[PDB]
Copies of this chain bind each other. A is one copy, B any other.
Amino acid sequence: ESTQVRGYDFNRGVNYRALLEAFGTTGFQATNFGRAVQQVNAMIEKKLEPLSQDEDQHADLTQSRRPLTSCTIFLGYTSNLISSGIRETIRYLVQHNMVDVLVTTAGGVEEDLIKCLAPTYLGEFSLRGKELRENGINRIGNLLVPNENYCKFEDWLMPILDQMVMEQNTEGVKWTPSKMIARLGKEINNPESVYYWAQKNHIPVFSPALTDGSLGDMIFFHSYKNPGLVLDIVEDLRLINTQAIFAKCTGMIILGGGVVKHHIANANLMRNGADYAVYINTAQEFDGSDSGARPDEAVSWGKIRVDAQPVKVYADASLVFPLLVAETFAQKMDAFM
């Protein structure tokens, strides 16, 4: 039962599918990439298995309109990836109903909406903050966002916050982050937006610290003009946890660390663990942080089943997530239509 190390032979010419396939026998993180392709393809193939359970009960127990499949896939990603071109990548998966639950941080919501109003630009990591600040330019890694983008966001968002307060106070709406994100996706009304497609396809988005970013800034300023908006995080905890509890199987695809990683993993502890899991991040374990914990720490908690074969790829997801999608979801497009 032994596989030999061998890399792609460019004497064959350039066949990119064969080149990507060769990662599996190349070693180090290339091999982990091949293992991740296999784990995600196992999630997809399980998802496509037919099932025959009670539609109305499920909906009652989860308080969700989304129909159950044979594998509930949780996709988590940090804010920076929505500032990156991986935004397109994630939007594709959600547009085609390929995942079931989204978890991201506040920036990961608002920068998708802002990109429908104005673009993000390429820059460099080493650009100095004094000069950028003096020019009204904000840096995100090697990306750049002008202050004017947030001005356009403000103008777009304040009338929606007005309606939200009115609906809460006179139509009994109890706002949560996931409910707000669904509404913003409907309002942005733009097929380039992740959250437009999420609400159209009844994919919920959880973001328990939704106030930590520009949407927070705007909610804050808005509240001195139109007081009273409340965002409850308790009901959203019930919604995410019941997505895990009532699943047939679950898979986790987690890009980055922080709350998005922990929140997906903790939901899956409710069912004594995910059946499949892929982490892609650059965090290291040695400082004891949750972000840097290997999948095998999650096993000790019951967040990943002891019989699962989870995979971590240690790499920037801007490089590896498009390749992963290319070899997995994008190959199964036939079945998602």
Which of B13, B25, B292 lies in contact with A122, CB distance below 8 A? B25
A314 CA to B232 CA in the complex, in Å?
36
Interface residues of A in 1-29 (CB under 8 A from B): 2-11, 13-14, 16-17, 19-20, 22-23, 25-29
A290 within 8 A of B: yes
A319 within 8 A of B: yes
A64: CB under 8 A from chain B?
no
User: When each residue 280-299 of chain A gets 1 if its CB lies under 8 Å from chain B and 0 otherwise, what string results?
Assistant: 01111111111111001111
Chain A 224-265 interface 0/1 with B at a Cβ cutoff of 8 Å (1 = within): 000001111111111001000000000000001111001100
Q: CB of A132 within 8 A of chain B?
A: yes
Given A284-B284, A319-B319; A231-B233 close (CB under 8 Å): yes
Residue of B nearest to A84 (CB): B27
Contacts of A319 in B (CB 8 A): 23, 29-30, 33, 315, 319-320
| Residue pair B306, A27 in contact (C-beta under 8 Å) | no
CA of A235 to CA of B233, assembled, Å = 12
User: Chain B's nearest CB lies how many Å from the CB of A277?
Assistant: 12
Which B-chain residue is minimally distant from A135 (CB atoms)?
Answer: B300
Contact A220 B208, beta carbon cutoff 8 Å: no
Q: Is A166 an interface residue (CB 8 A)?
A: no
Tell me the bound Cα distance from A285 to B84 in angstroms: 14
Asked if B5 and A143 make an inter-chain contact with CB atoms under 8 angstroms apart, the answer reads yes
Interface size on A, residues (CB 8 A): 131
CA distance A290 to B81 in the complex (A): 11
Tell which of B128, B138, B230 touches A301, judged by Cβ atoms closer than 8 Å.
B138
Q: Copies of this chain, how many?
A: 4
**Is A105's beta carbon under 8 Å from chain B?**
yes
Which of A66-74, A182-190, A210-218 forms part of the interface with chain B? A210-218
- Residues of A23-78 at the interface with B, using a CB-CB cut-off of 8 Å, are 23, 25-33, 78
In this complex, what residue of B is CB-closest to A78? B289
Task: Decide if B5 touches A288 in the complex (CB within 8 Å).
Answer: no
The residue on B at minimum CB distance from A127 is B300
Is A86 part of the contact surface with B, judged by Cβ < 8 Å?
yes
Residue of B whose beta carbon sits closest to that of A228: B234
Q: Measured between alpha carbons, how far is A33 from B6 in the docked complex, in Å?
A: 23
Known: A10-B92, A212-B266, A234-B230. A316 touches B298 (CB 8 A): no
Which of the listed residues A232, A285, A300 has the most CB atoms from chain B within 10 Å of its own CB?
A: A300
A11 to B325, CA, bound (A): 12
- Residues 177-205 of chain A, each 1 if its beta carbon lies under 8 Å from chain B, else 0: 00000000000000000000000000000
Question: Which chain B positions have C-beta within 8 A of A9?
Answer: 88, 92
Q: Can you pick out 25 interface pairs between chain A and chain B where the beta carbons lie within 8 Å of each other?
A: A3-B121, A4-B122, A5-B84, A7-B322, A8-B88, A13-B333, A27-B141, A28-B286, A29-B287, A80-B287, A125-B285, A128-B296, A129-B298, A129-B301, A129-B304, A134-B306, A141-B287, A141-B288, A210-B233, A212-B263, A220-B270, A223-B237, A259-B259, A286-B314, A319-B319
